[PDB]
Every structure is written in structure tokens, then in C-alpha cells.
Design a protein around this ligand. Structure first.
Ligand SMILES: O=c1ccn([C@H]2C[C@H](O)[C@@H](CO)O2)c(=O)[nH]1
Ligand SMILES: O=c1ccn([C@H]2C[C@H](O)[C@@H](CO)O2)c(=O)[nH]1
Lengths: 293, 290
């Protein structure tokens, strides 16, 4: 049995209208069950254009192809959203707080639509550590910049922490799907999630930087030693919030560069757009496989 | 005065790729493109910011196409008319922080001078009639402290988050020459979360009560806080660090002492979000006449 989507906030049951402000959707103007009740896979990534390309790429592989793919979030540009069959594709921008909003309103949408048996997957990009550019990483543990699998949030002035473990079973399943493809290297490892892309990640090419290359290396290698294989900016909340709500979730990012050799993203554009299809492809394999049982 | 960075590594690089802008030192002529820029405005929405550069252009008589300079990506949107640069930054400290790092570099590559950065944004109000525009005196964290904390190489760092004291009053004066809407100067709280992080009850997650919220928001009001948003802290911190004169002008979209949801008619909300645009336009008008 596929369990219903639950919230962890008793206030929503008691609201006469629930306005999903950043989606430009509302219970009083939209029928959630009719629009989303059949959704089973939610896919989320930073760029809206990427997540559109995804809903197109994926429609083709389940034979939905032809067609136009309307943005469900018309009347807003905070987030883009697309649906095809049981697959929802939603952008989330960059950074913990941007994705945190998307998730808050997303989960509520699933709860309103009365969805059940949903899987959430982040298809992102990252920087790798001691991996060839182009490798995809399936996250076991989202980790903070001190390598603790914790996510910290300040509520009413007090610090609260939730665990950022990702469903073990799903990472092993994803592992298998990538192999069925045999198209690109894929490892599982821990993902370090930061709040800054430059100083936040040992980079030497920001506007500010009070440290040396030798300092960047020491830090980055220490991270690798702790089981860390890539670096991005959303894995923590994603893990934390899904766990908080009992949702099955996973994170699949391609690395765009090996950080032990550089900071700047200087691959030909043609190569970087290939890199970014890898996670879409992998997740493509996962959904197709799942819809055959 | 010339824009600068506190980063020596940049001068040594054979090229500077601004990934999130889709802009490069070697595919792009920075001085040619941005050298004349005197006023940089930033905001969350790519729509609001296109709208802004359009409104400005007319108020300065440049009025009919406005090209997204950041075509080749959709991370951020960028526009230009005259000495006015308009930029999107999405939502949240890390999103604007990336925009900032790359923006500040861009300005240094164009070797601009006498620049002013302004975040024209939206917010939640505390004890302010909705539609009220706040001018940030002091960006502040969820503990009411004027510090911005950042982890670098595993170690904690904090920076002061005060905005230019002369610039805020100058903006207050400009809002007064307008006399179109209420403008207060107060402290702005900057949070990493819009829902649980801002004491809302309508999140997907929430284990407190309307009372706990009330007592928290009021504590903030007592601490001199008039609005809540999600960018002030970094924007402040980074500018101080690079010695740029910067301000934060935000329209309140609801009284957080009264509710959590953003319920007002699209008509009204649109009008609100034009207000900070109008003030900033004034300020630009003024600066050029002098
Ligand atoms: O070195 C990198 C490369 C990519 N990203 C992720 C997160 C961010 O939002 C986006 C930037 O391309 O992808 C990183 O965090 N670090
Ligand atoms: O109560 C509010 C209202 C608006 N915003 C701002 C900041 C953010 O980027 C966006 C969210 O609606 O607008 C807040 O942070 N809190």
C-alpha cells in the first residue's frame, strides 16, 4: 500500500484557504486532487529551463510524446512547474532558503492533492572531489561544511537540528539504474551542502578570499577523507524536510568540475549540456523501471 | 571612487568566467559594456527587474527594446539603460550571494566608479500598515544581532551588517519629496527560511503556536525591527567588505502581527511592488541633476 502524504503542521487542516504564494496556486481557485492526485514522481532542480527539458525528455521515454508543455506556474516567475502523467517537474532555484520555500509549498500541494506513494528526487549539478568531471553522485548523506549529517535551522531564535540521512534503499536502487545505462561514471558518496558558492566552498575566485590554494586543498581533501564526493547547495534541507515528513527522497547530481584541480567552470558549453542530461537520463531510467510493476 | 575587491587572486587569472551570468572576461568586453554604470539595482524577480529598468528608462527619457544581457542562462536576469544596471538575484542568502560575488567582480572588470548598489525588494512587516516601505538602517539576524555569519573552510566568520547611515536618510528625503506612501526607516530581520524561520504558521512544518509567534515578532519590534526578509544580511555584509555604498528598500506586503499568508488582490500587490521602484527612480533622478 502507498501511504498518503502527511503534513507536520496541524494549522493547514484548519485554514479556509491555503495560498501557495510562490506557485501562484490556491485551494480556493484550484482543484488539487484533480490536478495532482495521480502524481507519483516529483523531480526538482535549480533551473526552470532544465526542468522543462526534463519533462520533455521524459514524456518521450514513456511514450507521451508528439506537444506543448505548459508552465503550471503562470502568473509567477518564482518557480516553474510542469506535469506529464505521474511526473511533476518543479524548479527550485539556488540555495537552501530558495528550495526550502519550494518544498514547503510543494509538500502542502501533495497533501492537498491527496497524493500517495510519492518519491522526491533532486536532479542537480555540483562540484566533484577527486572524480572525473561528468561523474554523477548519488547522495547517501547530505552533510554540513563540518561534515556532520545535520541541518540547522533557527526557529523563533532557537537553533533546531534535523538529521540529513537519505533512504539507503533508494540510493542502491538508483545505483542499479545507472548501470543498466552504462553511459557515465556514477558513485555513491556523501554530499556537502553549503550556503555560499565561493568562500562557502573553498573557491579562490570570488570577490573576497582571505586564504591560499594550499588552504583550499587541505580542506577539500579532509572532506574527501570523510566520505564526501561532491558539493552543492540544497541537499541538506531537502534531506531534512523529506525526513521530517516521512517522504522517500533521493539526490542525484552531476559534477561539472573536479575541485582539486580548479574552481572555474571552463568546459565547452557543448560538454556541459551533455553533463547535465546525465542525471535526467538516470532518473528517466528509474521512472520507466518503476512503471513496469 | 573606484570599485575594488579584497581578493588578489583575481588580478592573476588569465580569464574570469562569471558562470551564473553566462558572462566571461574573454567572450565579453566589460569596460565597453558596463564602464558607465553608476546605479546598480537588484531584486528577486526577473520580471520585477525588467519592469524596473523600463520604468526608469522612461522617467529618464530614454523611451523600445530591453535585452536580457544574461541570455545564455536563466540563473539571473540582467538589464541596462544608461548608468543604471538592473539585476535579479532569486530568493535567499546564497542565491543573492552568488549574484553578488559575480556582480561585484563584473564592476571591477569594467573599472566603474562612484557606484551605488540598492536592493529593491519585498518583505513582511512588523507593526506596519501593509504597503509600507522600509529603508534598512541595520540588517539584522534572527537573534536581532547586526552580524552576518559565514562558514569558510569549516571555520565560522562574522561580519558587521550596517548600511550607509547617510544613504538611508537621503532615501527617506526622496520618499518625502514623493509623498505617495508611508516610508519608515527601521531594522530588517534577515532569515534563512520564509516559513518556520519567520515564525509563520502556514508551513508544511510547524510545531509552535500563534502566541509563540506573537511574542517572538514583538520581541523583534521592541528590538527596533520593522520588516522581515531573506537577503539584507549578505547584501550588507558583502558591500561593507568591498567598500560599496549600498541600501535596502523593501515594500511590506502584509502585517505579520496580523497574518501569515499573502492574500491581497493581485491588483494591490502589484501596486505595492512598484513603490520601492518609484522611490529608487526619484533618487536616481536627483543624483543625475546634481
Ligand atoms: O562547484 C559547484 C557547482 C555547482 N553547484 C550547484 C549548486 C548551485 O545552486 C549550482 C550552480 O551551478 O549547482 C555547487 O554548489 N558548486
Ligand atoms: O513575509 C515575507 C514577504 C516577502 N518576503 C520576500 C523575500 C523573498 O525573497 C520573497 C518571498 O515571497 O519576498 C519575505 O521574505 N517574507
Amino acid at each position: 500500500h502507498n501511504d498518503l502524504v502527511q503534513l507536520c503542521n496541524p494549522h493547514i487542516a484548519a485554514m479556509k484557504e491555503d495560498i501557495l504564494y510562490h506557485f501562484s496556486l490556491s485551494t480556493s481557485t484550484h482543484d488539487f486532487p484533480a490536478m495532482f492526485g495521480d502524481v507519483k514522481f516529483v523531480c526538482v532542480g535549480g533551473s526552470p529551463s532544465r526542468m522543462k527539458a526534463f519533462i520533455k525528455y521524459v514524456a518521450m521515454e514513456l511514450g507521451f510524446a508528439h506537444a506543448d508543455y505548459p508552465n503550471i506556474c503562470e502568473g509567477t516567475d518564482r518557480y516553474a512547474m510542469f506535469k506529464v502523467g505521474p511526473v511533476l517537474s518543479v524548479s527550485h532555484g539556488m540555495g537552501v532558503p530558495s528550495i526550502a520555500i519550494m518544498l514547503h509549498e510543494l509538500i502542502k500541494l501533495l497533501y492537498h492533492a491527496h497524493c500517495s506513494g510519492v518519491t522526491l528526487i533532486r536532479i542537480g549539478t555540483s562540484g566533484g572531489i577527486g572524480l572525473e568531471p561528468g561523474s554523477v553522485v548519488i547522495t547517501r548523506q547530505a552533510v554540513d561544511p563540518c561534515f556532520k549529517p545535520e541541518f540547522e535551522q533557527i526557529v523563533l531564535g532557537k537553533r533546531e537540528v534535523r538529521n540529513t540521512d537519505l533512504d539507503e534503499q533508494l540510493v542502491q536502487e538508483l545505483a542499479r539504474c545507472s548501470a543498466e545505462l552504462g553511459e557515465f561514471p556514477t558513485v555513491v558518496g556523501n554530499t556537502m551542502c553549503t550556503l555560499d558558492f565561493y568562500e562557502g566552498q573553498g573557491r579562490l575566485d570570488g570577490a573576497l578570499c582571505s586564504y591560499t590554494e594550499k588552504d583550499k586543498q587541505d580542506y577539500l581533501r579532509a572532506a574527501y577523507a570523510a566520505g564526501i564526493r561532491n558539493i552543492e547547495m540544497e541537499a541538506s534541507v531537502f534531506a531534512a524536510m523529506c525526513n521530517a515528513c516521512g517522504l522517500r527522497a533521493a539526490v542525484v547530481c552531476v559534477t561539472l568540475l573536479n575541485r582539486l584541480e580548479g574552481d572555474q567552470i571552463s568546459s565547452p558549453h557543448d560538454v556541459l549540456a551533455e553533463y547535465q542530461q546525465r542525471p535526467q537520463r538516470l532518473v528517466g531510467q528509474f521512472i520507466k523501471k518503476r512503471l513496469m510493476q
